[PDB]
Amino acid sequence: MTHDNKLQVEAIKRGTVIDHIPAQIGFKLLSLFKLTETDQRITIGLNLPSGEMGRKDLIKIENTFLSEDQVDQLALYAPQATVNRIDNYEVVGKSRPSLPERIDNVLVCPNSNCISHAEPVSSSFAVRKRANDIALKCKYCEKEFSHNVVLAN
Amino acid sequence: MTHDNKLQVEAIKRGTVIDHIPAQIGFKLLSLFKLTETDQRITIGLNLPSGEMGRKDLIKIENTFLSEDQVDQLALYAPQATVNRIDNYEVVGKSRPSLPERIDNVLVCPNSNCISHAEPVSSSFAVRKRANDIALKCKYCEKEFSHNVVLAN
Amino acid sequence: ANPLYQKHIISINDLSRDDLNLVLATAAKLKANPQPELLKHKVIASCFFEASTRTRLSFETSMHRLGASVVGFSDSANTSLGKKGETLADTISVISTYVDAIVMRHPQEGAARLATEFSGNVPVLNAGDGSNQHPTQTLLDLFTIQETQGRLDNLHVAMVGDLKYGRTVHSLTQALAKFDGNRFYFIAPDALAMPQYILDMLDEKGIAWSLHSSIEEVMAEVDILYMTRVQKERLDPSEYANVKAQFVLRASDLHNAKANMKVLHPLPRVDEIATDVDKTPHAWYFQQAGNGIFARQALLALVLNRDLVL
Amino acid sequence: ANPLYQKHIISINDLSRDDLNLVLATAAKLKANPQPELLKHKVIASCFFEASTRTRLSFETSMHRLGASVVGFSDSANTSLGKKGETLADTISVISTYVDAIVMRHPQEGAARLATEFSGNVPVLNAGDGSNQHPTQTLLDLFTIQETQGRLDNLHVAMVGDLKYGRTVHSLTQALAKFDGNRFYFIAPDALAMPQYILDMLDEKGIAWSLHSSIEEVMAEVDILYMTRVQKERLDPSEYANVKAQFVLRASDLHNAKANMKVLHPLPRVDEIATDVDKTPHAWYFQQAGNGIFARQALLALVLNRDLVL
Amino acid sequence: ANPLYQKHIISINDLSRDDLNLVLATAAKLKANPQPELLKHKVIASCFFEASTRTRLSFETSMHRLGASVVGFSDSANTSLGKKGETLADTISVISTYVDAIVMRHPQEGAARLATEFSGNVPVLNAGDGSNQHPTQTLLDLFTIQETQGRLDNLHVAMVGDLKYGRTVHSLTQALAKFDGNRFYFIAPDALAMPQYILDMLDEKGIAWSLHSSIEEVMAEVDILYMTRVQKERLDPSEYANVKAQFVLRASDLHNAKANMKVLHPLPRVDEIATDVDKTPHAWYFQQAGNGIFARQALLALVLNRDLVL
Amino acid sequence: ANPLYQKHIISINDLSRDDLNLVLATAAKLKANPQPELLKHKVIASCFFEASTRTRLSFETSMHRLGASVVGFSDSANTSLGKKGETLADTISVISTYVDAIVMRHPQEGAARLATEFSGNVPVLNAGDGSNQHPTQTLLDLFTIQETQGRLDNLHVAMVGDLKYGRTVHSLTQALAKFDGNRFYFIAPDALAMPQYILDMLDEKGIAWSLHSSIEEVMAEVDILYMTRVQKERLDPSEYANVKAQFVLRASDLHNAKANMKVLHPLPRVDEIATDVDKTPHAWYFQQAGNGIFARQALLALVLNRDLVL
Ligand SMILES: Nc1ccn([C@@H]2O[C@H](COP(=O)(O)OP(=O)(O)OP(=O)(O)O)[C@@H](O)[C@H]2O)c(=O)n1
Ligand SMILES: Nc1ccn([C@@H]2O[C@H](COP(=O)(O)OP(=O)(O)OP(=O)(O)O)[C@@H](O)[C@H]2O)c(=O)n1
Ligand SMILES: [Zn+2]
Ligand SMILES: [Zn+2]
């Protein structure tokens, strides 16, 4: 409780605010990282007017503190986000993401003869080579692809 | 004012507020009806306190009037959902979903041999309230299934 | 222009009573005076993605008897389309680029109706789609009931055999329910029962039906006895042979049938109708296959011609 | 008697500019007024020793649209010839004993031209021979460029896809080099590059060509965009999918194409051209398959007729 | 000698309560204190006229952990015996002069029993004969029920799936009906129900059984849930996808189960048991397949050794 | 325990310099002083979901010369596991309760690694997984390079053929790049060249490599000539017959070779190595296949034995 409004919405009593999500990564992030399967109040702001990107997206999850490597799975999609941890109306913490060494479950190996497709295992990629442009190697078939390519399909 | 409710509300000017989304159908509806593929401001609230109806979800889509056909599709998922349009700061229409005649696109034929599976086709089912339940007949294979078989797959 | 002009004959549930009677009165005229040049210069495609010789030879002969040319393939014997990843939408968008109508059989249910979304104005006629429809087998059956019984209403029709999976008994029961005062007798083993959705549709229209375990219970009253083949793989070896294989007709059972009673069977018959039955006047299964020529001719005539002078 | 009378249409390198224009002006007349009885009483053989449905149905329909009869076989599905040790010379010396022209596809390169040594005076038309020629696919492609662009010279033609093994891009580049001031843009992954013998022939005639890695680099200037299918077995799974699978067209890339630009694709297309492209006015792959009817009709008319009154 | 010494193991019907207990007792001892040179110098034949990888490898690993040698075969589109002309009787008459025991699986029922009349004094063990019998699966099921529940009588056993044609469920009910006070719950699609013969038997012995509609209805009282696979072949795709809101098992469904409730499946478990059941305490189908080794070792040791003092 | 005790052998990437040397050391000891009862009482599974006669027999002969028992299968148009529905995960979960080790070869990449997550504590050894990995071929190649040249570093190794898709050449380069000072010459058709990833790796380590056009260019400096087969599938017959005046090996070509130069080939060697090379001193591909036995014996003994004091 404190004056929400909605161009930049306000105060959750303790929880996580992932702010500065680029436009249209917000919903993708809720889809991929299953952030919605909580009984907690989640408030989400989509296509919002501020912090210069101009338009950003924002997610607020009360009472859940997702962190350190959760914040890092966010790096491939929302690298400039800030993940504000909050206790008793104050941002007792501000993180940003960094490339993790491993991205589990969220990607799909583009190699169609990979065994990963058909089975009760989850995908796993070894990550490497920061901002000049990321390569991802499948755990199973050991084929290294360009992140642009895995991230398309 | 306070018995919280609002806390300085995301009261919008023109738009659609879908209120009383049953809990957990909230995200389902964004995905299925592709409601986030817009540039207008959306604010979503999940697992809200609705002491008055346990838990609910609510999507606020601005400068968007989602209507008639669009409203009726939601019947299968959120049958007690009030859509309210807002023209200039208050409720101008407050519609309820009624079961439609056909349900297109969103739904998959249970029938593994139905041609809809391998092809560039938008699914389509003809809706029939066979009093007790709703049966859905596929356009293509013409097999009829309870809406509960279809709503998983 | 006649109602069927340039329509897609995809399903029996889309053809009305009037549509049905129009095809059946045209079949009767073509049977009586031939019009062997009516579809002159028309080219028709006969696409049988799943092989079915009986049906193909008959569709094509009736195309030939109205003067049309035929190009096409029988497959389930790898004649190259479906290779690479050619979708059915794409095959039909290229085939309707040069033929005047498509006749097609396909293994998945719904394939003919999807073809319809891609053909433009080339009519699609369904020669069978998986376990869903087969309009032209129901049209020839009906024509054979009408021609031998004089009517399509007030009939006492027994359906015998595998009623659960038999695609043609399900459609002929929906067509006959379009008409009046027909009465049904179903005689099926327990595992091969007529599905509830048929029975529920019959009840809802006030049509009378009943289940019997012996043909002998109902022979006397019966006008059309439609026999179906049981496929033994739908049961096990010992089930098929056990007390359930007595859905077989012999000449001796016809003893007391009405003079007008006819035995109909879509075919192949393997043993459910014994060979001694063929010598009786009630055997009409082959004359029924012969009538497939005029019912398919009539549908092609009506669909490709604006106006028809009879 | 016209120049093509009773010739063998074996290869694009044997047909001159004038030959090409004659087939293409006849295709245009048959498209406009039909001559459905021109090949009346002619019987033609359609020998497809290697199955190819798309090509067969089209050759045969165009035979049917000029009134000829067709006998023949599709094989790669053991229809008995080749048994014992029947050489191809012997099969063609018996088939030319009763048909008036042979259309044939065969897996080895050179088979149509050998057929020519044994047919006597029965013309042989090649419907594809291994990785060598396919005249009738290049004739329908050309007709589709001419009909939509008004010309066959001064064109900006981009060829996209597997340019190394694609039998039709190699022939259409040799046909277009017969004409003037055409400009080529090749966009191919490194492993699927256009062969040197094409490039050397282009250089030697002063024709301009260039390699680009993105369609986006050249869209603006382009009149005909000929897309080819990559077969994934020519690369490995992970190669196909890696950065090299971006030779795929989507509607969004057409953003800035000239109003006259057309997308052509011999087919099957599986994913190199996305389905949303079909709704654009630039999608002409199916109208291109439809034009195969008039280009094959024209070749059969010109080859079997002395004189043709148009 | 022990009761089963030199005996033929063909049907669960032929082995009494005490023979079953003897086997289960031995298997518990061989699991505990292995004796790897017990059949040193015996050669067993693994004649799989019908292929089963899982069953063949369990058997041959059994033969090898007791030190025996193995000669044999499996057959799909292959290796000679039977062919047609070669009788099963003559194959067995010839192989009975070479080996010390014959484990065989054959597609026609009673093949193992026919074999018994030609093998001389060579014991034959049935690994599957059509839809009739599979004793060594029943033996490993009962060993898994006995080592997890502690007893083989007074159990509340739920049987689920295709009860009409799961051969292992017909055997398992026969065998559990030789012990006392067992209550049976049979949850099947009514198209796929327990035959009247199993039920007719169970009432003569006074055993309590009931039929339920879904597992959720008995989850609370059950000790063994024996899941069978529903066979899509003899079911329509639309029927198969229709039954209830299914009869597949998920961990959500298990939240009610007793702590000692175990889920068994002869395997393969394609989709009726979801992957999340695999991580619960109740999942016992893989441990069940490992007990195949101990159950089969026990049978081979008792058949080929007179007295086993282990 | 020894470093590799109970370890999974899936990729050459995962075994360090010292692990490779350990294997090669053991293999030299097992070649010298055989120990045929070392795995007495172990049962290994030879799961060849993809058939390789040469690899399967080398492995099973390895299993048997250390006294182990073998259960397993190979598969072309045959025997059950996988089928579709049966997951690899469930096959391995079931077979891990029966055996002590799993050697497997499968057509999809990473199948051996998927297996490792279901085999419990049962070691799995990769015998081929698609185009990814084949460690035991690399292990026998390095044992053949070490016993003929005396060392595994400072070698002038020539690699020839399809460098782009020979899976053994990608592994061999990875492994020889863990030892020091090796110089590589890569003679390939440029259609078939070393991928940039191998090369990109080699430059980070500082290794010297060069690409040549024909073996004759390096014959004088080379110690190992590792010949690979050029795969006619992914090559046009005309391209294949065109490259250079080839890259096949004949004794005439060898007149220049060093006395210790050996020619290796993973086999089969259809035609790139002529029969006259077989009689020279430099021919070592058959001796190389015999060393498969010693390399595979070493790996099985270290994986299944804690301490080997041989
Ligand atoms: N109890 C609170 C306090 C703050 N916020 C959210 O915390 C986010 C950012 O934290 P803050 O440091 O308080 O504002 P900024 O200084 O703008 O943070 P930054 O500069 O890193 O964006 C804002 O989106 C605000 O909505 C919140 O929802 N609930
Ligand atoms: N300027 C406005 C006016 C209304 N609303 C929303 O529109 C909905 C309309 O409900 P309303 O008729 O105003 O009162 P309720 O009793 O909440 O409607 P209902 O009976 O459906 O619960 C409310 O959720 C309210 O937040 C809004 O966001 N902005
Ligand atoms: Zn992979
Ligand atoms: Zn359907």
Q: Is F82 on the interface with A (CB under 8 A)?
A: no
The DSSP secondary-structure symbol of F207 reads -
Q: Which residues line ligand 1 (CB under 6 A)?
A: A 8, 10-12, 17, 19, 60, 82, 84, 86, 89, 91, 94
**Cβ contact F130–A141 (<8 Å):** yes
> Which of C79, C83, C95, C100 is the best substitution to test chain D (most D C-beta atoms within 10 A)?
C79
Sheet with strand C43-48: strands edge to edge: C69-74, C43-48, C102-106, C124-129
Report the residue of chain B nearest A6, measured CA to CA: B10
**Dihedral pair phi/psi, residue E14, rounded to 5°:** -85, 0
From A1, A84, A87, mutation site for ligand 1 pocket: most ligand atoms within 8 A of C-beta: A84
Element (H, E) at D292: helix D285-304
Using CA atoms, how far residue D151 sits from D88, D143, D145, D289, in Å, is: 40, 10, 7, 19
What is the C-alpha to C-alpha distance for residues A124 and D15, in angstroms, rounded to an integer?
A: 57
Claim to verify: residue C159 and residue C303 sit in the same structural domain: no
Amino acid at E37: E
Residue B67 distance to chain A (closest CA, Å): 21
At a CB cut-off of 8 Å and minimum separation 6, what does F257 contact? Answer: F219, F220, F222, F225, F282
Structural domain range at position F187: 134-291
Token pair 């306000």 is found at A10
Amino acid at E23: V
What is the C-alpha to C-alpha distance for residues E99 and E105, in angstroms, rounded to an integer?
A: 17
* Residue A141 assigned ligand-binding role: yes
Neighbouring subunits of C (3+ Cβ pairs under 8 A): B, D, E
Helix (H, G, I), strand (E, B) or coil at A134: coil
Query: What letters, b where the CB count within 10 A reaches 16 and e where it falls short, cover F46-67?
Result: bbbbbeeeebbebbbebbebbe
What is the C-alpha to C-alpha distance for residues E264 and E254, in angstroms, rounded to an integer?
A: 14
Residue C147 distance to chain E (closest CA, Å): 34
Claim to verify: residue F85 and residue F110 sit in the same structural domain: yes
Amino acid at D227: M
Residue D144 distance to chain C (closest CA, Å): 14
Taken in order E270, E272, E278, E284, is the CA torsion positive or negative?
negative
Query: Which tokens in the block code for residue B29?
Result: 């509806």
Q: Which ligand is nearest to the CA of A60?
A: 1
Claim to verify: residue F126 and residue F189 sit in the same structural domain: no
Nearest in space to B76 (alpha carbons), one of B127, B5, B9: B127
Amino acid at F45: A
How many Cβ atoms are within 10 Å of A7's Cβ, its own excluded?
10
What is the C-alpha to C-alpha distance for residues D210 and D225, in angstroms, rounded to an integer?
A: 14
Using CA atoms, how far residue C109 sits from C8, C56, C118, C189, C190, in Å, is: 16, 19, 17, 26, 26
Q: How many domains does one find in chain D? A: 2
User: Is the distance from CB of F200 to CB of F259 less than 8 angstroms?
Assistant: no
User: Is the distance from CB of B83 to CB of B97 less than 8 angstroms?
Assistant: yes
User: Is the distance from CB of E21 to CB of E2 less than 8 angstroms?
Assistant: no
Q: Name which residue sits closest to atom 12 of ligand 2, judged by CA.
A: B91
**Dihedral pair phi/psi, residue A83, rounded to 5°:** -120, 105
Using CA atoms, how far residue B17 sits from B11, B20, B62, B89, D57, in Å, is: 10, 10, 8, 12, 56
How many Cβ atoms are within 10 Å of C243's Cβ, its own excluded?
7
What is the C-alpha to C-alpha distance for residues F286 and F293, in angstroms, rounded to an integer?
A: 12
Quickly name the fold that domain B8-100 has.
Alpha-Beta Plaits (3.30.70)
Q: How far is CA D108 from the centre of its chain?
A: 17
Question: Residue C112 Cα, ligand 4 centroid: separation in angstroms?
Answer: 12
Which residues does chain A have within 8 Å of residue F89's beta carbon, measured at their own beta carbons?
119-121
The DSSP bridge pattern shows strands A56-62 and A15-22 to be antiparallel
Q: Which of E54, E64, E271 sits opposite F94 (nearest CB)?
A: E54
**Cβ contact E245–B113 (<8 Å):** no
Query: Which tokens in the block code for residue F126?
Result: 């990769």
Helix (H, G, I), strand (E, B) or coil at D141: helix
Question: Residue F163 Cα, ligand 3 centroid: separation in angstroms?
Answer: 21
Claim to verify: residue F122 and residue F147 sit in the same structural domain: no
Claim to verify: residue F46 and residue F13 sit in the same structural domain: yes
Claim to verify: residue E169 and residue E281 sit in the same structural domain: yes
Helix (H, G, I), strand (E, B) or coil at E3: coil
**Cβ contact B42–A38 (<8 Å):** no
User: Is the distance from CB of E38 to CB of F41 less than 8 angstroms?
Assistant: no
CATH number at residue E308: 3.40.50.1370
Give the CA count within 13 Å in the CB-facing half-sphere of E176: 35
Locate all alpha helices (DSSP H) within chain F, ordered by sequence.
Answer: 17-32, 53-65, 88-95, 111-116, 135-149, 167-176, 196-204, 237-240, 251-254, 285-304
- Selecting among F8, F56, F65, F134, the annotated active-site residue is F134
What is the C-alpha to C-alpha distance for residues E66 and E64, in angstroms, rounded to an integer?
A: 5
Can you give the resolution of this entry in Å?
Answer: 2.5
Q: Is D242 on the interface with A (CB under 8 A)?
A: yes
Angle between helices C17-32 and C135-149 (to 10 degrees): 70
- Selecting among E55, E91, E116, E144, the annotated active-site residue is E55
What is the C-alpha to C-alpha distance for residues E185 and E207, in angstroms, rounded to an integer?
A: 11
Claim to verify: residue F163 and residue F250 sit in the same structural domain: yes
Rg (CA), chain C: 20
Assess whether chains B and F touch, using the rule of 3 or more C-beta pairs within 8 angstroms: no
Residue E229 distance to chain B (closest CA, Å): 17
User: Is the distance from CB of B4 to CB of A1 less than 8 angstroms?
Assistant: yes
Query: Which tokens in the block code for residue F200?
Result: 């990109």
What is the C-alpha to C-alpha distance for residues C20 and B16, in angstroms, rounded to an integer?
A: 49
Locate all alpha helices (DSSP H) within chain E, ordered by sequence.
Answer: 17-32, 53-65, 88-95, 111-116, 135-149, 167-176, 196-204, 237-240, 251-254, 285-304
Query: Which tokens in the block code for residue C239?
Result: 């089930």
Q: Name which residue sits closest to atom 13 of ligand 1, judged by CA.
A: A91
Question: Residue B24 Cα, ligand 1 centroid: separation in angstroms?
Answer: 27
Claim to verify: residue F127 and residue F170 sit in the same structural domain: no
Angle between helices F88-95 and E285-304 (to 10 degrees): 40
User: Is the distance from CB of E155 to CB of E183 less than 8 angstroms?
Assistant: yes
Nearest in space to D168 (alpha carbons), one of D200, D207, D128, D197: D128
Element (H, E) at D301: helix D285-304
Residue E242 distance to chain B (closest CA, Å): 6
Which residues does chain A have within 8 Å of residue D242's beta carbon, measured at their own beta carbons?
110, 145-146, 149
User: Is the distance from CB of E188 to CB of E219 less than 8 angstroms?
Assistant: no
Q: Identify whether F55 is a catalytic site residue.
A: yes
DSSP secondary structure, A23-77, as one string: TTTHHHHHHHTTTT-SSS-EEEEEEE--GGGSSEEEEEEET----THHHHHGGGT
At a CB cut-off of 8 Å and minimum separation 6, what does D253 contact? Answer: D215, D216, D219
Amino acid at D288: Q
User: Is the distance from CB of D299 to CB of D125 less than 8 angstroms?
Assistant: yes
Residues of D with a known catalytic role: 54-55, 84, 105, 134
Q: Is C262 left (phi over 0), alpha (psi -120 to 50) or beta?
A: beta
Question: Strands, DSSP E only, in D16-98?
Answer: 43-48, 69-74
Query: Which tokens in the block code for residue E134?
Result: 């599979």
Nearest in space to A24 (alpha carbons), one of A70, A99, A78: A78
> Which of D170, D239, D242, D243 is the best substitution to test chain F (most F C-beta atoms within 10 A)?
D239
- Selecting among E8, E105, E106, E269, the annotated active-site residue is E105
Rg (CA), chain D: 20
Question: Strands, DSSP E only, in E197-247?
Answer: 208-212, 224-227
What is the C-alpha to C-alpha distance for residues A33 and A76, in angstroms, rounded to an integer?
A: 12
Burial (CB count <10 Å: 0-12, 13-18, 19+), residue C18 = exposed
Helix (H, G, I), strand (E, B) or coil at D295: helix
Claim to verify: residue E105 and residue E20 sit in the same structural domain: yes
DSSP secondary structure, chain C, as one string: --TTTT--B--GGGS-HHHHHHHHHHHHHHHHS--TTTTTT-EEEEEESS--HHHHHHHHHHHHTTT-EEEEEE-SS--SBTBTT--HHHHHHHHTTT-S-EEEEESSBTHHHHHHTTSTTS-EEEEEETTS--HHHHHHHHHHHHHHHS-SSS-EEEEES--SS-HHHHHHHHHHTTSSS-EEEEE--GGGPPPHHHHHHHHHTT-EEEE-S-GGGTGGG-SEEEE-PPPGGGS-HHHHHTGGG---B-GGGGGG--TT-EEE--S--SSSB-TTGGGSTTB-HHHHHHHHHHHHHHHHHHHH-SS---
Q: Which ligand is nearest to the CA of A95?
A: 1
The DSSP secondary-structure symbol of A131 reads T
The DSSP bridge pattern shows strands C224-227 and D224-227 to be unpaired
Q: How far is CA B65 from the centre of its chain?
A: 14
* Ligand 1 nearest atom to the CA of residue A9, by list position: 26
> Which of F108, F126, F165, F201 is the best substitution to test chain A (most A C-beta atoms within 10 A)?
F108
What is the C-alpha to C-alpha distance for residues F160 and F170, in angstroms, rounded to an integer?
A: 12
* Ligand 1 nearest atom to the CA of residue A58, by list position: 24
Claim to verify: residue D43 and residue D187 sit in the same structural domain: no
Amino acid at D196: Q
The DSSP secondary-structure symbol of A120 reads S
Claim to verify: residue D6 and residue D111 sit in the same structural domain: yes
How many Cβ atoms are within 10 Å of C34's Cβ, its own excluded?
13
Claim to verify: residue D154 and residue D196 sit in the same structural domain: yes
**Dihedral pair phi/psi, residue D118, rounded to 5°:** -120, -15
What is the C-alpha to C-alpha distance for residues F2 and F5, in angstroms, rounded to an integer?
A: 5
Question: Residue C130 Cα, ligand 4 centroid: separation in angstroms?
Answer: 11
Whether the ω angle into residue D268 lies within 30 degrees of 0, i.e. cis, is yes
Query: What letters, b where the CB count within 10 A reaches 16 and e where it falls short, cover E217-229?
Result: ebbeebbbbbbbb
Element (H, E) at D286: helix D285-304
DSSP secondary structure, C222-291, as one string: -SEEEE-PPPGGGS-HHHHHTGGG---B-GGGGGG--TT-EEE--S--SSSB-TTGGGSTTB-HHHHHHH
Using CA atoms, how far residue D84 sits from D61, D80, D81, D87, in Å, is: 33, 9, 8, 9
Amino acid at C82: G
Using CA atoms, how far residue B8 sits from A46, B4, B12, B13, C135, in Å, is: 18, 9, 12, 15, 64
Q: Is D190 on the interface with F (CB under 8 A)?
A: no
Which residues does chain A have within 8 Å of residue F106's beta carbon, measured at their own beta carbons?
115
From A19, A53, A61, mutation site for ligand 1 pocket: most ligand atoms within 8 A of C-beta: A19
Question: Residue B32 Cα, ligand 2 centroid: separation in angstroms?
Answer: 24
Q: Which residues line ligand 2 (CB under 6 A)?
A: B 11-12, 17, 19, 60, 82, 84, 86, 89-91, 94
* Ligand 1 nearest atom to the CA of residue A20, by list position: 22
Nearest in space to F186 (alpha carbons), one of F209, F202, F204, F206: F209
The structural domains of chain A, with segments of one domain joined by +, span 8-100, 101-153
**Dihedral pair phi/psi, residue C169, rounded to 5°:** -65, -35
Query: Which tokens in the block code for residue E136?
Result: 């060594």
Q: Identify whether F105 is a catalytic site residue.
A: yes
Element (H, E) at B130: strand B124-130
How many Cβ atoms are within 10 Å of E259's Cβ, its own excluded?
6
DSSP secondary structure, B72-88, as one string: HHGGGT-SS-EEEEESS
What is the C-alpha to C-alpha distance for residues F214 and C293, in angstroms, rounded to an integer?
A: 71
Amino acid at E299: L
At a CB cut-off of 8 Å and minimum separation 6, what does E13 contact? Answer: E133, E174
Q: Which CATH entry fits the domain spanning B101-153: 2.60.120.10, 2.40.160.10, 2.40.110.10, 2.30.30.20?
A: 2.30.30.20
